[PDB]
Amino acid sequence: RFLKVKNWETDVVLTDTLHLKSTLETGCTEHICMGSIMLPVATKDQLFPLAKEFLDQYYSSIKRFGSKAHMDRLEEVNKEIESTSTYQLKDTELIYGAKHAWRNASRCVGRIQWSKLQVFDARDCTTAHGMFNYICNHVKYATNKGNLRSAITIFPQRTDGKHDFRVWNSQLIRYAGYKQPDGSTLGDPANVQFTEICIQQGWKAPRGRFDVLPLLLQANGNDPELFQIPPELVLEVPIRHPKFDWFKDLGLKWYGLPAVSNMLLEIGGLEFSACPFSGWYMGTEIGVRDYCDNSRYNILEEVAKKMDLDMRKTSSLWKDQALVEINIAVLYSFQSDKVTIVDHHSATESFIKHMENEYRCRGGCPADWVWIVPPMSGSITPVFHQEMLNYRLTPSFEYQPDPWNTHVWKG
Amino acid sequence: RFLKVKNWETDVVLTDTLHLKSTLETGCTEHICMGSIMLPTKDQLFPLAKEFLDQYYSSIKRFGSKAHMDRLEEVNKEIESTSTYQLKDTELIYGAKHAWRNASRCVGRIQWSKLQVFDARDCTTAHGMFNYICNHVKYATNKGNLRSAITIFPQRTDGKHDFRVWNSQLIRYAGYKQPDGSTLGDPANVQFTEICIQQGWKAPRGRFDVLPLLLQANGNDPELFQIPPELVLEVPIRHPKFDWFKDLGLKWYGLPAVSNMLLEIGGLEFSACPFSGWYMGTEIGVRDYCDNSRYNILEEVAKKMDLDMRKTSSLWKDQALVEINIAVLYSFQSDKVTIVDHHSATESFIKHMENEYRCRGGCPADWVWIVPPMSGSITPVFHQEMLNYRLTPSFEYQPDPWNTHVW
Ligand code: HEM
Ligand code: HEM
Ligand SMILES: Cc1cc(N)nc(C[C@H]2CNC[C@H]2OCCNCCc2cccc(F)c2)c1
Ligand SMILES: Cc1cc(N)nc(C[C@H]2CNC[C@H]2OCCNCCc2cccc(F)c2)c1
Ligand SMILES: C[C@H](O)[C@H](O)[C@H]1CNc2nc(N)[nH]c(=O)c2N1
Ligand SMILES: C[C@H](O)[C@H](O)[C@H]1CNc2nc(N)[nH]c(=O)c2N1
Ligand SMILES: [Zn+2]
């Protein structure tokens, strides 16, 4: 079956055959679409077929499908599975696997870069202190004094599900949130819970509006342990505006390195529950979501007062006006300090080129329109007008429950 | 069976049971989501009628009463004899209100039960259609105090005697391809404009020429008609801060009136059913004015604003977008023509959803369409999970008649 997608701005039609490979479920049915729903121990039995499918993919990618080396690898993995109930990936397979999980991430607009990904193999790691060291090196390499480089660090795979490696942080770098008795929140409201957990684990909170959180690291199923990332390793950018001199007095800053640390990486049926990865920001992530969401820093009102906008009625579009200014400020501040950032116009234009290329060379590109279209100025970006098909390919990045919900405390 | 939808900003969770009454297919499968694809007999007619009549009689709390069963036998008999049937006026009104209620891509549904239904099922000619349409336009415009309305022409018979309005909307602006190779006026209507000209329309060849109506009655060739200009309320576009805004030469019409869709009630097909409401400001200010394949005025406006157009990262397009949208709303408000901004419309829609979940067990909603084409995440709908499914009665798309009609 061939499926077509059309761009309604350019009339370009593309043909997807790749979706035929898709194994997993979407959440939708012939009678209901769950396209806007945010979230819609493996055995020997299920494991070899997952391993085979992955090695067939890997050996096709290197143009050695059906070779002796291909056949020998299948038998060796099969034998390792019957012997030990699991198997170990080669370095090369691990690299290919991690790159492909990114290549397959349908909610990621930054995928044009998928094949430049620095893979750090941390599968010899045994302790939380070892994790902290691996994570510091990742941050330093990825930050690169502002010239950001994509990277992922891969800790040991799940075994019985009782010995998981986890990074308890949702991102490697984030700011604390503190609920006051009067119901107001100081810092980032998204991190209130995680911040309480840290404090309870013995973190001494400085209790300001931008306190970088400590790392909370679990190795081999043990109780997690706290670490402060060295501050010379945390690149931050004070936010100012190219025309509004008062913008700086809002006291805003943000960190330069977006690094997601709470996803599960699946490769050939193996589960990597700690696999922190990082790229660089698209401006709207900070300026639209982090600063302007009502449940986040929520600065729209304050910024609009300072611009003296008419706030008596929504139809003055004061919210929209202040929103664009904050986003100019974010981009300007990053560019002036030579910290890599991409604006939403440029990122979306690159994505369309990436998608066309993927359709030609790969037979498709799974994409989640709800997520790809930026949270401001939707239809002035070319992705708004692009039909997309969403489907699940492996290797993949998946969500997993927050560890404080599942962890067995040892004391 | 029971499905939950969460709002991530407010933590409100709703439970959807209404989806279980869906019959039509979505285009998705368990292996693929098509949520962003724009277009994904006697025997057939009776279950359809029975399903419609059951929901009707239940809506007036007479499910399974004497009247209910009686109507079912009467429709059954008429189907058995004539191969079709006729809706009672009450059913036609209910079916139209519900097709709007069920329109998953419409953010304006809080208003669904206040719809004026004009029954035009006695119409026989294009001149008659023209009269009904003018009456619809004058009624709906109401000197700027807009009122929602639908006019419903005779249902389909053999499919060779279709009533059709060939316009996509009752009121739209002409578009002309030029020697230069550029486009004057609205490029979305270049083809339609040409069909009007090959029908003998004398085009003023301007940037805002109201198109004639092209009306097909009973399967015949369509005929041209000019709407009386005094019936077409228009708004000159000016800006509350920027004096120079007036000089761009911009205006828009007050009445949004979709005229190319098909209304399905009880298995009966109404191929001509123009309906109208009132604008959300972004439809004009973001889509009509700023789409690259439309009026595409971004470059011009950013110019008058002396913005830095060197690099995309100065957000010049975004700054200009906002001003333009302020201007559209300001103009309509100053002229007392009903309009709603995207903030107010999406807040009403969240309220409507809450109403529908408690009263009806759900609300079918297409997030890709409900979320405004600007400032998405600062509107509450962005943070609202929605379930999309197809309920009947419904509005459906149909082929452009010029690809189908036999001249
Ligand atoms: C190189 C620059 C990159 C840019 C500009 C970028 C852009 C983005 C953006 C804007 C999102 C949406 C996140 C949200 O709104 O919550 C996203 C999601 C995602 N990206 Fe990227 N990305 C980049 C690199 C990467 C890398 C290196 C990986 C992994 C190797 C990755 C994998 C993912 C995944 C798995 C998601 C889904 C997150 C979720 O569902 O919560 N991306 N990307
Ligand atoms: C009265 C105020 C109304 C507002 C503010 C409103 C708002 C909108 C908007 C913004 C769209 C999306 C159109 C697009 O982006 O192309 C839409 C679509 C739609 N609306 Fe409404 N609406 C209103 C009344 C109505 C009425 C009276 C009906 C019919 C009785 C209706 C039925 C529909 C349908 C069927 C669609 C989908 C059309 C398509 O797919 O092209 N709406 N509405
Ligand atoms: C690698 C990378 C590069 C980049 N530019 N941006 C990113 C996403 C990060 C940063 N800016 C947002 C954050 O995204 C990670 C969290 N994403 C939403 C998680 C979520 C919450 C609730 C329900 C769900 F289903 C999912 C990663
Ligand atoms: C009744 C009403 C009120 C309102 N405020 N707004 C409206 C939508 C009108 C106005 N502003 C746009 C137009 O919408 C009608 C055309 N809609 C898209 C047609 C289409 C093309 C190609 C593929 C598709 F799947 C669909 C109706
Ligand atoms: C309900 C809705 O699906 C949810 O708010 C989504 C919408 N699109 C998104 N898109 C991105 N990139 N990130 C998000 O967090 C969301 N949130
Ligand atoms: C490809 C994509 O589905 C298409 O551009 C859609 C997206 N969302 C939309 N939303 C509305 N309200 N109107 C539209 O025309 C569209 N276009
Ligand atoms: Zn779907």
PDB file of N, CA and C and ligand atoms in Angstrom, chain A residues 26-29 32-36 390, chain B residues 26-29 32-36 388, ligand 7:
ATOM      1  N   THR A  26      -0.657   2.921  17.400  1.00  0.00           N
ATOM      2  CA  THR A  26      -0.635   4.402  17.496  1.00  0.00           C
ATOM      3  C   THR A  26      -1.510   4.953  18.624  1.00  0.00           C
ATOM      4  N   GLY A  27      -2.558   4.222  18.972  1.00  0.00           N
ATOM      5  CA  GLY A  27      -3.575   4.784  19.856  1.00  0.00           C
ATOM      6  C   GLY A  27      -4.874   4.999  19.110  1.00  0.00           C
ATOM      7  N   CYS A  28      -4.799   5.207  17.797  1.00  0.00           N
ATOM      8  CA  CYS A  28      -6.005   5.424  16.976  1.00  0.00           C
ATOM      9  C   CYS A  28      -6.658   4.129  16.524  1.00  0.00           C
ATOM     10  N   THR A  29      -7.888   4.252  16.031  1.00  0.00           N
ATOM     11  CA  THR A  29      -8.577   3.159  15.358  1.00  0.00           C
ATOM     12  C   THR A  29      -9.297   3.707  14.130  1.00  0.00           C
ATOM     13  N   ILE A  32     -11.793   6.261  15.727  1.00  0.00           N
ATOM     14  CA  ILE A  32     -11.372   7.347  16.618  1.00  0.00           C
ATOM     15  C   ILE A  32      -9.905   7.759  16.370  1.00  0.00           C
ATOM     16  N   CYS A  33      -9.645   9.068  16.406  1.00  0.00           N
ATOM     17  CA  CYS A  33      -8.283   9.574  16.250  1.00  0.00           C
ATOM     18  C   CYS A  33      -7.776  10.142  17.576  1.00  0.00           C
ATOM     19  N   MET A  34      -6.636   9.626  18.029  1.00  0.00           N
ATOM     20  CA  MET A  34      -6.041  10.078  19.296  1.00  0.00           C
ATOM     21  C   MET A  34      -4.777  10.885  19.059  1.00  0.00           C
ATOM     22  N   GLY A  35      -4.747  11.556  17.903  1.00  0.00           N
ATOM     23  CA  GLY A  35      -3.609  12.361  17.478  1.00  0.00           C
ATOM     24  C   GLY A  35      -3.239  13.495  18.421  1.00  0.00           C
ATOM     25  N   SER A  36      -4.166  13.952  19.257  1.00  0.00           N
ATOM     26  CA  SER A  36      -3.802  14.996  20.207  1.00  0.00           C
ATOM     27  C   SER A  36      -3.759  14.521  21.655  1.00  0.00           C
ATOM     28  N   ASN A 390       1.822   9.757  10.844  1.00  0.00           N
ATOM     29  CA  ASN A 390       2.447   9.391  12.082  1.00  0.00           C
ATOM     30  C   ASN A 390       2.315   7.891  12.306  1.00  0.00           C
TER      31      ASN A 390
ATOM     32  N   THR B  26     -12.471   7.230  10.288  1.00  0.00           N
ATOM     33  CA  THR B  26     -11.612   8.437  10.469  1.00  0.00           C
ATOM     34  C   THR B  26     -10.441   8.579   9.502  1.00  0.00           C
ATOM     35  N   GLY B  27     -10.060   7.495   8.845  1.00  0.00           N
ATOM     36  CA  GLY B  27      -8.849   7.490   8.034  1.00  0.00           C
ATOM     37  C   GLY B  27      -7.661   6.893   8.776  1.00  0.00           C
ATOM     38  N   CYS B  28      -7.644   7.005  10.106  1.00  0.00           N
ATOM     39  CA  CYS B  28      -6.600   6.366  10.916  1.00  0.00           C
ATOM     40  C   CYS B  28      -6.793   4.853  11.013  1.00  0.00           C
ATOM     41  N   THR B  29      -5.729   4.163  11.413  1.00  0.00           N
ATOM     42  CA  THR B  29      -5.778   2.749  11.790  1.00  0.00           C
ATOM     43  C   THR B  29      -4.950   2.609  13.063  1.00  0.00           C
ATOM     44  N   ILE B  32      -1.333   3.546  11.967  1.00  0.00           N
ATOM     45  CA  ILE B  32      -1.037   4.837  11.340  1.00  0.00           C
ATOM     46  C   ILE B  32      -2.052   5.929  11.705  1.00  0.00           C
ATOM     47  N   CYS B  33      -1.539   7.116  12.058  1.00  0.00           N
ATOM     48  CA  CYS B  33      -2.396   8.277  12.293  1.00  0.00           C
ATOM     49  C   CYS B  33      -2.424   9.236  11.101  1.00  0.00           C
ATOM     50  N   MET B  34      -3.633   9.505  10.608  1.00  0.00           N
ATOM     51  CA  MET B  34      -3.827  10.400   9.483  1.00  0.00           C
ATOM     52  C   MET B  34      -4.434  11.719   9.937  1.00  0.00           C
ATOM     53  N   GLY B  35      -4.240  12.056  11.223  1.00  0.00           N
ATOM     54  CA  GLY B  35      -4.881  13.229  11.839  1.00  0.00           C
ATOM     55  C   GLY B  35      -4.586  14.569  11.182  1.00  0.00           C
ATOM     56  N   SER B  36      -3.521  14.643  10.388  1.00  0.00           N
ATOM     57  CA  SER B  36      -3.213  15.891   9.673  1.00  0.00           C
ATOM     58  C   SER B  36      -3.443  15.827   8.152  1.00  0.00           C
ATOM     59  N   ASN B 388     -11.098  12.903  18.142  1.00  0.00           N
ATOM     60  CA  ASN B 388     -11.786  13.167  16.894  1.00  0.00           C
ATOM     61  C   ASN B 388     -12.484  11.913  16.375  1.00  0.00           C
TER      62      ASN B 388
HETATM   63 ZN    ZN C   7      -5.240   9.467  14.251  1.00  0.00          ZN
END
